[PDB]
């Protein structure tokens, strides 16, 4: 079981209208813990364990870390935009960066740039350079590559700074982050003369990864018999999922829903 910390940045330019837009987000183990605006310029919390005043030692550098990235993102946005000869046009820039720590503390990092919703530049730490996903990204690639110092600092963040911040977060996170709540499983139905639609829902659970499948006569049904689950979020930090099965009216009883989740001690089987 590995752990992750990654930030997401997004902003847009304006059609000849100076300035832009902006917003950043921080996720640890796919759990959103921090939000940042440019319009308000305030760093809000997104979980109880990582609060402004509650253990505000980290909220200090974390609030610095983002303001810094904001500046860098702005510089980068301009660099990329100007290297496309883009001005009176409206464009977007998205960045994703973070690190993935393994059970053994061996880290893997990444830093990717998305321009106008498409892959553009991707940091390759191992070779201390960037991969241009498309021709128009090379001018920027060459700029960033003129002095290896940039790549060196970047890699240093991904392999040192980031993991250290992950560990520190995994700290004030224990008890809530690793906390898993199992799903409430319900099998509803919609009956008509020609067919009965079975619906199996897994509710208010967390983490999001879950397993849902139909059983015919207490036995597994080929995966290709029902579309895979659909997983959706609830605004409260929990998730829900559902699967569907169309069967001949009368046969309902032969079908059962089986749901598996780490929060459950063993697979849970629900009747129609």
């Amino acid at each position: 079981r590995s752990h992750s910390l990654h930030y997401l940045f997004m902003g847009a330019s304006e059609q000849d209208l100076g300035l832009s837009l902006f917003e950043a987000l921080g996720y640890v183990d796919d759990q959103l813990f921090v939000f940042y605006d440019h319009e308000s310029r305030r760093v809000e919390p997104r979980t109880p364990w990582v609060s402004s005043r509650i253990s505000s030692q980290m909220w200090l550098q974390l609030s610095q870390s983002l303001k810094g990235w904001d500046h860098m993102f702005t510089v980068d946005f301009w660099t990329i935009m100007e290297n496309h000869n883009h001005s009176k046009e409206s464009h977007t820039l998205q960045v994703i960066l973070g690190c993935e720590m393994q059970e053994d503390n061996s880290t893997e990092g990444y830093w990717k740039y998305g321009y106008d919703g498409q892959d553009h530049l991707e940091f390759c730490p191992d070779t201390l350079d960037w991969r241009a996903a498309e021709p128009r990204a090379w001018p920027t690639k060459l700029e960033w590559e003129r002095h290896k110092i940039r790549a060196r600092q970047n890699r240093a963040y991904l392999e040192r700074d980031c993991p250290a911040q992950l560990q520190q977060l995994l700290e004030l996170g224990r008890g809530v982050l690793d906390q898993q709540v199992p799903p409430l499983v319900k099998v509803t139905h919609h009956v008509t003369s020609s067919v009965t639609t079975l619906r199996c829902r897994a509710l208010n659970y967390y983490p999001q990864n879950i397993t849902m499948k139909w059983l015919k006569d207490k036995q597994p049904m080929d995966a290709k018999e029902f579309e895979p689950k659909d997983v959706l979020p609830n605004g409260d930090g929990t998730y829900q999922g559902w699967i569907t099965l169309a069967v001949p009216p009368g046969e309902e009883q032969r079908y059962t829903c089986q749901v598996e989740h780490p929060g459950l001690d063993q697979p849970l089987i629900v009747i129609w």
Partner: protein
């Protein structure tokens, strides 16, 4: 590239008349991010609607969640109204009480 939003409307818990619940409208897979979402109660745009923070997935597409506390009845109809640059006019997806 531009991507049109996928729209899904559902309830927090299975709907039981008179029982408090939550109506959700999840928009995703769209680009750019400028999008406008409304939750409807019999055509009447509902006010006091909450939304998660704009975010995006691996493919750079954006996703946003819109939700409101509410108590359904039999006369009540709910839907989600979405407009995006990729759409000519607002698209409306009705809330299927079974979802």
């Amino acid at each position: 590239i531009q991507r049109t939003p996928k729209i899904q409307v559902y309830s927090r818990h299975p709907a039981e008349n008179g029982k408090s619940n939550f109506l959700n409208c999840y928009v995703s897979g769209f680009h750019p991010s400028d999008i406008e979402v409304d939750l409807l109660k019999n055509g009447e745009r509902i006010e006091k609607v909450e939304h998660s923070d704009l975010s995006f997935s691996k493919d750079w597409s954006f996703y946003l969640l819109y939700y409101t506390e509410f108590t359904p009845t039999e006369k009540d109809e709910y839907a989600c109204r979405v407009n995006h640059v990729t759409l000519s006019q607002p698209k409306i997806v009705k809330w299927d009480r079974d979802m």
